[PDB]
Amino acid sequence: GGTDPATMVNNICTFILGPFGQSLAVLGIVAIGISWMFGRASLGLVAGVVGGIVIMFGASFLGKTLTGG
Amino acid sequence: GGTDPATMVNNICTFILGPFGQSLAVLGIVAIGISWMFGRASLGLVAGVVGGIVIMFGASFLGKTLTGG
Amino acid sequence: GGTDPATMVNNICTFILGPFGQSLAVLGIVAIGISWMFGRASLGLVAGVVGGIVIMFGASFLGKTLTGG
Amino acid sequence: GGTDPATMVNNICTFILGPFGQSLAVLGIVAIGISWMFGRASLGLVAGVVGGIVIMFGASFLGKTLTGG
Amino acid sequence: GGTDPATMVNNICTFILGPFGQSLAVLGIVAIGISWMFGRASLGLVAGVVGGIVIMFGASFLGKTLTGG
Amino acid sequence: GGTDPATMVNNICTFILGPFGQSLAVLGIVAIGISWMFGRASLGLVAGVVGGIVIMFGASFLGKTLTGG
Amino acid sequence: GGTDPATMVNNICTFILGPFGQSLAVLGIVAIGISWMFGRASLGLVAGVVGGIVIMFGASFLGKTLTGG
Amino acid sequence: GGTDPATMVNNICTFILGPFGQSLAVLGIVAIGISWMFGRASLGLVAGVVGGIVIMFGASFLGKTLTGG
Amino acid sequence: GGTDPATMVNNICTFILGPFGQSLAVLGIVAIGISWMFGRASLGLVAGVVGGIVIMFGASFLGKTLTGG
Amino acid sequence: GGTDPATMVNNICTFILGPFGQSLAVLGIVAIGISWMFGRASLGLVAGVVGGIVIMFGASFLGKTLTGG
Amino acid sequence: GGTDPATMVNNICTFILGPFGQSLAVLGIVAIGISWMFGRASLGLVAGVVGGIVIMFGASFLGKTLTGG
Amino acid sequence: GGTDPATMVNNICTFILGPFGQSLAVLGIVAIGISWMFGRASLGLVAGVVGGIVIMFGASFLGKTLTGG
Amino acid sequence: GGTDPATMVNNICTFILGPFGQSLAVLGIVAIGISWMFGRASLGLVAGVVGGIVIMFGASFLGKTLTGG
Amino acid sequence: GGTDPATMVNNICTFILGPFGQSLAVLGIVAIGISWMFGRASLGLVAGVVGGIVIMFGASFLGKTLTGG
Amino acid sequence: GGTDPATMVNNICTFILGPFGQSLAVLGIVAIGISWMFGRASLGLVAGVVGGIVIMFGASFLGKTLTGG
Amino acid sequence: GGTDPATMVNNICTFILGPFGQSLAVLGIVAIGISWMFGRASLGLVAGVVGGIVIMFGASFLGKTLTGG
Amino acid sequence: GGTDPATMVNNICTFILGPFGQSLAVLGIVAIGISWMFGRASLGLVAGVVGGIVIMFGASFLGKTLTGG
Amino acid sequence: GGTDPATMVNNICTFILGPFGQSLAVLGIVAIGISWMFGRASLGLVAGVVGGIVIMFGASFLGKTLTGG
Amino acid sequence: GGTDPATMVNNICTFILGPFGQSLAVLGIVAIGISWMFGRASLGLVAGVVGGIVIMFGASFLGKTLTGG
Amino acid sequence: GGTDPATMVNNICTFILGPFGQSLAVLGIVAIGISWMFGRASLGLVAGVVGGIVIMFGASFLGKTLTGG
Ligand SMILES: CCCCCCCCCCCCCC(=O)O[C@@H](COC(=O)CCCCCCCCCC)COP(=O)(O)OCCN
Ligand SMILES: CCCCCCCCCCCCCC(=O)O[C@@H](COC(=O)CCCCCCCCCC)COP(=O)(O)OCCN
Ligand SMILES: CCCCCCCCCCCCCC(=O)O[C@@H](COC(=O)CCCCCCCCCC)COP(=O)(O)OCCN
Ligand SMILES: CCCCCCCCCCCCCC(=O)O[C@@H](COC(=O)CCCCCCCCCC)COP(=O)(O)OCCN
Ligand SMILES: CCCCCCCCCCCCCC(=O)O[C@@H](COC(=O)CCCCCCCCCC)COP(=O)(O)OCCN
Ligand SMILES: CCCCCCCCCCCCCC(=O)O[C@@H](COC(=O)CCCCCCCCCC)COP(=O)(O)OCCN
Ligand SMILES: CCCCCCCCCCCCCC(=O)O[C@@H](COC(=O)CCCCCCCCCC)COP(=O)(O)OCCN
Ligand SMILES: CCCCCCCCCCCCCC(=O)O[C@@H](COC(=O)CCCCCCCCCC)COP(=O)(O)OCCN
Ligand SMILES: CCCCCCCCCCCCCC(=O)O[C@@H](COC(=O)CCCCCCCCCC)COP(=O)(O)OCCN
Ligand SMILES: CCCCCCCCCCCCCC(=O)O[C@@H](COC(=O)CCCCCCCCCC)COP(=O)(O)OCCN
Ligand SMILES: CCCCCCCCCCCCCC(=O)O[C@@H](COC(=O)CCCCCCCCCC)COP(=O)(O)OCCN
Ligand SMILES: CCCCCCCCCCCCCC(=O)O[C@@H](COC(=O)CCCCCCCCCC)COP(=O)(O)OCCN
Ligand SMILES: CCCCCCCCCCCCCC(=O)O[C@@H](COC(=O)CCCCCCCCCC)COP(=O)(O)OCCN
Ligand SMILES: CCCCCCCCCCCCCC(=O)O[C@@H](COC(=O)CCCCCCCCCC)COP(=O)(O)OCCN
Ligand SMILES: CCCCCCCCCCCCCC(=O)O[C@@H](COC(=O)CCCCCCCCCC)COP(=O)(O)OCCN
Ligand SMILES: CCCCCCCCCCCCCC(=O)O[C@@H](COC(=O)CCCCCCCCCC)COP(=O)(O)OCCN
């Protein structure tokens, strides 16, 4: 009978922000560690990646506040 | 039948943080030693590389704490 | 469900200023000691490193005062 | 029914200049402290970062004055 | 009955140069502040962004003068 | 599974302050002896090197006291 | 059929720490001797190069201890 | 009568990982040597190329482990 | 009738490592000599170039050992 | 019909090591003389430049011996 | 077919420690003699240069003993 | 309706040369004092900084005179 | 009815070289003053910026002379 | 009745090389001046732009000579 | 809502010249005492450091007088 | 009656490798000279261009050897 | 009727190496003089620029010799 | 109708070597005087700057002689 | 309409050699007096500074005579 | 048509060793005289400068003998 998109998109968000996003952020941190190992350590890389993680896990509240509710 | 990404990404993390990351850090230390041999010894290089190794092997707990759980 | 960045950034600050920053400052002092052992002892190095440590552990109050509250 | 951008952009500014910018400036100060610890202490780094913080928290009045009102 | 484009384009200009452009310039200044915080402070970035703001808010007079009237 | 940096940095400190720092200080004393043999004996060299050794082996308590705890 | 990286990286480490690293350290010592011949003899150069050699040949145990095992 | 793709793709993998991949890796090493000869020697190039070779010859086990079997 | 790539790539390697690579290394040594003549003599340049030559002429054995055979 | 690179690179080497390299070394010696005239006379400059000249004119035999033939 | 670096680096060491290093040490002694002729005779210069020569010609045994074998 | 850049740039100049430049020069003087406290007192630093302040507060008349009006 | 580009480009030049370029040069001088305040005073910066200003305000005569009329 | 392209293309060339190209070159010089004001002064920019102007105003003779007449 | 830089820079000055600068000057005096203890007592060091302290605590009035108000 | 492509492609090769390629290489050398005049002299540019010329004039023998005949 | 490229490319070379290259080299020498006036005098700049001029005016003979005729 | 570059480059040279280069050299001499006033007087600075001026005003004859005519 | 650089550079020279250079020389003399007060009186300092002043105020005639007119 | 570098470099050498080097050595002798007038007379300065002059005017024979012909 199909389901309304208000539940399918919410399922997508719950999946991408549940246990999957945790391991994705872990992989991001592993990536910045490896990039510091072989090369140069610059604050820009860590700042950008930590900001990306914050934006990923703040998407809910960022969307709630940016749209006035 | 395929497997859910919650296990595949975890397998990736376990591989990259198991016996492989050990030898990768060993190669990083060999690299900083060689860079000190032919050239100048600066605290910046060792600080950056040791920090990269710490970030690589702290990725799990860093991810657990940075996301509030 | 995600967490608001006002808590994630605070967690980052608490981690980087808790038991980790203590050992990081200890490593900085070990570094200045080693740099005095093999080489020349200059007030500039110790002044800069102690100032860096003070700025690291004063970041909270420095931010509170520099922004007028 | 949607909201006019004159309120959404203002919400963005209020969020980025409220409790979030405080901790962001705190992280910037932690960064300059860490950069002074492992390396050399130069007035350029602190000048640039403090100027960045001032520009971030002066954005409102800087915009009001630069546009003649 | 529709409206002539001489009023619709003027409405677009008035909207984009009224209260919206103010907050947009505020966001630009916040952006340059954040870019100075985590990274390097270069006169090029501030020069370019302030020039962009000037060109945005000078568009009316720039258009009046560049076309001889 | 990785380890939290609060243990890795502590391991670094324990290694650099255990049996390794002893022989490093021994090498420093050998160095000042050799520098006195072929050349001039100045109180500045011995003062600086002994101060470096004290700072290396006082790093723990110096860090505990400089940070108020 | 290919080989798992846990053996290839180990082969790299064994090669770089076997008979090759010996002659590389010999070349480093020849380099510091030549640098002392034509120029000035400073404890900093020898300290840095011997430390680089120690870090190169201690990479295995340094990696074992820095990672808690 | 044709053959099932489960054998054709396996033939492709066996060819690309047999005696051909050996000489391809040899060419990669020749390339990094030539790039070090005329230019600057950076750890990034060698790290990237050796990692590419490891990924090429670890493709089998990497695929076996990343897919949980 | 064409030839299998296992012979063409081998021909490429034999050409690039035969009499051509000798004169290429000779040109590299001429280059480092000229760079020492007009400018400053740094161990880094010679170390990097000699390492590049070694990697070029060790490509065969490096490939044989890095791949476990 | 073109010529094989084994002759073109050899022509390059013969040109750069024939009558041209002689006058280039003469210019290098003129340079070190001028640098001693207006400034300070340090053994490092002459050592580096004479070593550069030796490496330039020893490139042939250095290449023959460094490659085992 | 190329040669393994274990022989090329050994060839480098044999060349730099054979008949070439003898004349290089002779030039070093000529240098210290000339520096004593026009100027002041200090034990530091001779000590440093003789130590450099000893380190150059002791590189083999110094490397054998410093690495425990 | 926007404002002509002849007023916006003038507003920028008035802001940067009004009460803000005073405190900026005060910070510059504090900086040179701190640099004299921990380190060496050289006329070059004070000369450069006082010249920078003079150029900052002479920008108006310097621009008027350098352009012939 | 539109205007010929020979007048529009001339209007652009007159605007960019009239009262706007004056304040732009004033901002450039403020910039070099600020760069001298927090940092090092080098003749290169002032030379480059004054040359840029001269080229900006000499564009007319430079164009007249470079094109033979 | 239309005109032959041998006159229309010539009209295009005369327009683009008459009074219009003069002011275009003036704008180019203003551009290089502004680029030197806010940023770094490099010979490459001025060389490229002056070469572009020369090529623009030499197009006639360059075309006459490149085509043998 | 942010604060105007005329108050933030003033807060910076008040902090750096309040109770913090007192203890900083105390540390400077301790430094000159320690430098006199182990070494030679020269009027230059004390003159420079006392002048640095005077410039630090005279920054306000020095700025008021150097700028004509 | 047309000609077989085995002669037309050979004519193309003979033209592009006859008297035309000579002047093309001459233009390439003029280009690298001009690029060294206005800018920085880097071994990479000359190495790349000389390698391009060698590959252009070695195309015949490179094709003969790469294809096993 | 068109002309064969063997004459057009030769015309290009004759133009770029005739009276134009003379004044281009004159401009290069003016450039190195100006770069020595405002800044530091380094042998590298003059060496690179004179080498660029030599390569520009040696392009003919360099091409004749590098291609074996 | 455009002008041939043989006249435009000559105009550039005449401008840069006419009354402009005189005042540029005057500014260079003022610069070396100011650098001697606040700082240390070293023969290297004056030698380099006078050599730069000589090279600037000798560019014509230097170009005539370096190119054999 | 802009002004030719022959007047702008002359304005720069007139400003830097008018009433400004007088007070700059006065500051230089104050500097040498202060340097004699706290420290040692050496003829080298006064000779260098008076020579710097002479070169600053002789720049015009020095430029006129050094260039043959 | 260009000239071969074997004549251009020879022209450079003839110019730098003809009537120009004579006056350059005269300036060097004037420099050592002035340095003896205001300051201390040390054999090191005269030895170094006379050696620089000898090396400048012996460059031809030094190059002929150092290269075995
Ligand atoms: C647009 C706004 C600009 C604001 C800038 C004001 C900054 C003033 C600080 C002057 C710093 C000067 C740099 C310097 O020179 O290093 C000095 C520092 O040491 C100290 O005192 C360290 C203690 C300072 C702690 C102060 C805390 C500020 C927090 C500010 C939020 C050591 O000498 P190092 O020996 O220099 O010698 C190496 C040669 N390179
Ligand atoms: C078309 C219009 C153009 C307008 C441009 C005017 C901008 C003038 C600002 C000159 C900035 C110069 C950059 C620089 O050089 O960094 C300096 C800055 O520090 C400060 O003073 C920070 C305090 C400045 C706060 C001023 C606020 C402006 C708001 C403007 C709305 C530090 O030195 P960093 O040490 O340079 O050294 C690294 C080497 N790269
Ligand atoms: C066919 C007609 C062509 C006309 C073109 C004339 C345009 C001239 C403007 C030269 C712009 C040059 C670009 C540049 O280079 O950026 C500069 C600009 O900054 C400024 O001055 C900004 C203030 C300019 C405000 C001028 C307003 C023009 C309105 C024109 C209607 C900053 O440096 P960014 O640091 O470059 O460094 C990044 C490296 N990529
Ligand atoms: C986030 C974590 C950060 C951890 C950083 C701790 C590192 C502490 C090491 C301090 C190094 C300081 C650098 C320095 O200054 O060089 C010194 C070194 O010499 C030595 O002792 C060499 C022996 C050290 C061996 C120690 C082995 C560490 C392994 C660590 C896994 C020589 O003087 P060089 O004379 O400086 O003078 C040139 C001026 N540039
Ligand atoms: C949705 C899932 C996402 C998963 C992504 C995880 C990947 C993590 C690997 C981080 C790679 C970071 C890239 C990088 O930055 O290059 C580094 C790499 O070198 C290495 O360590 C090479 C050894 C790595 C071998 C690891 C094998 C993974 C197999 C995975 C199946 C070198 O530095 P190059 O010097 O960067 O500098 C050029 C500037 N551009
Ligand atoms: C995922 C796997 C990653 C594996 C990476 C391991 C690589 C370790 C090699 C560390 C290389 C460090 C680079 C470096 O820093 O250059 C050094 C090198 O010189 C040498 O010893 C050259 C001899 C090395 C020969 C070793 C042969 C490896 C073959 C490997 C198959 C010179 O100093 P240059 O002076 O740096 O200074 C310029 C500042 N940029
Ligand atoms: C992975 C392999 C690595 C191999 C590296 C071995 C290289 C050993 C050569 C040590 C060079 C050390 C550099 C140095 O330091 O310069 C010295 C050199 O002078 C000489 O002896 C010149 C004569 C050397 C001729 C030797 C010929 C090698 C050919 C090799 C094919 C001068 O002092 P400059 O005074 O330093 O002071 C400036 C401060 N920067
Ligand atoms: C992390 C590990 C650190 C290890 C460091 C130990 C090194 C100890 C050597 C102390 C060297 C001190 C330097 C110094 O000061 O120079 C002295 C040297 O002379 C000698 O004895 C030369 C004979 C030494 C031969 C010893 C061979 C070591 C091999 C080591 C493999 C001369 O005086 P120069 O007169 O100083 O005066 C100029 C003022 N700058
Ligand atoms: C194409 C045109 C070129 C024009 C260039 C003329 C510039 C002449 C100024 C020479 C500056 C020389 C730089 C220098 O060397 O710093 C000196 C400066 O101090 C002063 O006098 C500061 C007072 C100068 C105020 C003059 C105001 C000019 C406005 C110009 C509009 C300090 O010594 P710092 O001790 O050098 O030592 C560090 C070693 N790096
Ligand atoms: C195909 C034709 C090519 C023509 C090119 C001729 C250009 C010659 C100008 C040489 C410029 C050299 C660049 C340079 O090097 O910067 C110098 C410039 O300063 C000045 O004199 C500025 C005054 C020049 C005003 C001259 C006006 C030309 C108008 C031309 C129409 C400062 O040093 P910055 O300190 O370099 O140090 C940073 C390290 N990157
Ligand atoms: C099949 C035929 C091919 C023919 C090609 C010959 C072209 C040779 C011209 C070499 C151009 C090289 C490009 C370059 O590199 O830019 C240089 C140019 O400057 C100049 O001399 C400008 C003056 C040249 C005027 C010459 C007029 C040619 C007319 C030709 C009709 C500046 O350096 P920019 O600093 O590079 O640095 C940025 C890094 N990207
Ligand atoms: C373009 C404008 C240029 C202006 C420059 C004028 C500066 C004149 C000050 C001369 C300073 C000379 C430097 C020097 O030489 O140090 C002296 C200083 O001591 C003092 O008197 C300290 C008390 C001075 C307090 C004066 C306050 C100025 C505020 C100015 C706003 C100590 O000797 P140190 O023993 O030198 O010996 C080490 C060898 N290196
Ligand atoms: C599936 C098969 C794959 C085969 C690939 C093998 C190719 C190996 C050639 C490695 C080329 C590496 C590229 C490079 O990096 O440029 C180098 C090249 O210079 C040279 O040696 C030029 C001389 C080479 C002549 C060799 C002739 C091959 C014919 C082959 C038929 C210069 O440095 P540029 O300075 O890089 O710096 C710019 C940063 N981008
Ligand atoms: C696959 C084939 C590869 C062939 C490559 C051989 C090239 C050898 C030339 C080595 C060039 C090295 C580059 C370099 O390093 O610049 C040197 C050059 O100066 C000179 O001698 C200029 C005179 C050279 C004239 C030689 C003419 C070759 C024609 C060749 C046809 C200056 O120092 P700059 O001071 O480096 O310092 C800046 C730091 N970046
Ligand atoms: C492939 C060809 C290579 C050709 C290169 C030959 C160049 C020889 C010139 C040696 C220059 C050496 C550089 C140097 O070292 O600076 C010296 C220069 O002073 C002078 O004599 C200036 C007078 C020279 C005028 C000579 C005119 C050449 C025209 C050439 C056309 C000053 O000392 P600065 O004190 O060094 O100290 C700072 C430490 N960095
Ligand atoms: C890899 C090969 C290495 C070869 C190096 C051999 C070089 C030997 C020359 C030793 C030079 C030692 C330097 C020195 O120390 O300066 C001495 C020089 O004076 C002279 O005799 C000048 C006359 C020498 C003329 C000799 C001509 C060599 C040509 C060589 C082609 C003066 O004393 P300055 O008083 O030192 O005091 C300042 C404190 N810094």
Author numbering:
A (entry chain a), B (entry chain b), C (entry chain T), D (entry chain S), E (entry chain R), F (entry chain U), ...: 5 to 73
What does the paper say about this structure?
Here, we determine atomic structures by cryo-electron microscopy of three conjugative pili, two from hyperthermophilic archaea (Aeropyrum pernix and Pyrobaculum calidifontis) and one encoded by the Ti plasmid of the bacterium Agrobacterium tumefaciens, and show that the archaeal pili are homologous to bacterial mating pili. With structures for four bacterial conjugation pili (pED208, F, pKpQIL, and pTiC58 from A. tumefaciens) and two archaeal ones (A. pernix and P. calidifontis), it is clear that there is a common architecture for all and obvious homology, despite negligible sequence similarity. Each prokaryotic pilin subunit consists of two or three hydrophobic α-helices, with kinks appearing in some of the helices, such as in A. pernix and A. tumefaciens. Hence, pore diameters of all prokaryotic conjugative pili are sufficiently wide for the passage of ssDNA, but not dsDNA.
To extend the comparison between the archaeal mating pili and the existing structures of bacterial ones, we used cryo-EM to solve the structure of the A. tumefaciens T-pilus encoded by the pTiC58 plasmid to 3.5 Å resolution. The T-pilus has a fivefold rotational symmetry with a rise of 13.7 Å and a twist of 32.5° per subunit. The 3.5 Å resolution of the T-pilus map allowed for unambiguous model building and interpretation of the protein subunit, VirB2. The atomic model of VirB2 shows clear structural homology to the TraA subunit of the F-pilus. One clear difference between VirB2 on the one hand, and TraA of pED208 on the other, is that there are kinks in helix 1 and 3 of the VirB2 subunit, produced by Pro23 and Phe61, respectively. Similar to other bacterial conjugation pili, there is a stoichiometry of one lipid molecule to each protein subunit. The same analysis applied to VirB2 T-pili revealed a strikingly different set of PLA2-resistant lipids, with >65% of the phospholipids being phosphatidyl-ethanolamine (PE). The electrostatic surface for the lumen of the T-pilus generated by the atomic model is overall quite positive. While the lumen of other bacterial mating pili may have evolved to be optimal for DNA transport, the lumen of the T-pilus, also used for the transport of a diverse range of other substrates, has a positive electrostatic potential that would still allow DNA transfer, but not be optimal due to the greater friction resulting from DNA sticking to the walls. Surprisingly, the cryo-EM structure of VirB2 reveals no cyclization of the pilin.
